[PDB]
């Protein structure tokens, strides 16, 4: 209940700050003021066109490595096990195959931002 109250208090504080920011000052709104910025000229495009990012393979690899992270994270409770040899071998194999995947992608130029 305590953490819930602190979360709600922080949310209410941020809402109070932005409500003060919006209801305190004086408003004078017109079209040239609220136009998009674009460094002092009218934008050619609509800023919603396709962007064509260059690190898409790195993003998918990040998804896979994040799930490898999720696999690796119960290690602080895994080291409390009674066997510890199969645990050590399994952790070594997991880190080794993750590193092998990273090395293969590096060799095949996956993380090189193909334009």
């Amino acid at each position: 209940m305590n953490l819930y109250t602190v979360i709600f208090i922080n949310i209410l504080l941020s809402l109070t700050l932005i409500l003060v920011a919006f209801w305190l000052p004086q408003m004078n709104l017109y079209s040239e003021k609220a136009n998009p910025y674009e460094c002092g000229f009218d934008p050619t495009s609509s800023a919603r066109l396709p962007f064509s990012m260059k690190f898409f393979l790195v993003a998918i690899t990040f998804l896979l490595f994040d799930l490898e992270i999720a696999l690796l994270l119960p290690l602080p409770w895994a080291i409390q096990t009674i066997k510890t040899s199969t645990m050590m071998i399994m952790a070594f194999i997991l880190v080794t195959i993750l590193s092998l995947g990273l090395a293969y992608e590096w060799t095949q130029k996956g993380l090189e931002w193909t334009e």
Binding site: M27, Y30, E32, K33, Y37, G40, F41
Partner: protein
């Protein structure tokens, strides 16, 4: 007395707006060279609380420092309009004041006051960085003199 409380509140908001002046990272010419010489360690505008911000949304005063070309003028007007409401203009140098050396040119706006409302005119070609700092402090005094809450209360 409501007049006294309103006057003190107005003095407080004027103190805030004059102690936190954020000019825009926007110059045009040799006058902007002197403007960053005013940013230099000698006449520290950051010591005065004056610090550049690149976006006009986070700017407070446009320091028009340079020659306002005809091709440049829509950009300057758009950039000024994109500022939030308590905005000021310091024209700097003869070009921004009244055209200066290029007054009779076919491509120069004869003074930036034809385009934007100018609060403070700083003369020189270039005005020294000391002179631009003088204009900045004169602008601070000018917005110290403003009485928005008192005019509202007697409105």
């Amino acid at each position: 007395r409501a007049e006294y409380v309103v006057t003190k509140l107005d003095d407080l908001i004027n103190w805030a707006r004059r102690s936190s002046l954020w000019p825009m990272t926007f110059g045009l010419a040799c006058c902007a060279v002197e403007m960053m010489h005013m940013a230099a360690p000698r006449y520290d505008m950051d010591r005065f609380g004056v610090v550049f911000r690149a976006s006009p949304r986070q700017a407070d005063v446009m320091i028009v420092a340079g020659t306002l070309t005809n091709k440049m003028a829509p950009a300057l007007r758009k950039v000024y309009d994109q500022m939030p409401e308590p905005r000021y203009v310091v024209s700097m140098g003869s070009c921004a004041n009244g055209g200066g050396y290029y007054h009779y040119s076919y491509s120069v706006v004869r003074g930036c006051d034809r385009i934007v409302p100018v609060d403070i005119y700083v003369p020189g070609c270039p005005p020294t960085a000391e002179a631009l700092l003088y204009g900045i402090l004169q602008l601070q005094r000018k917005i110290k003199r403003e009485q928005k809450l008192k005019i509202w209360y007697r409105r």
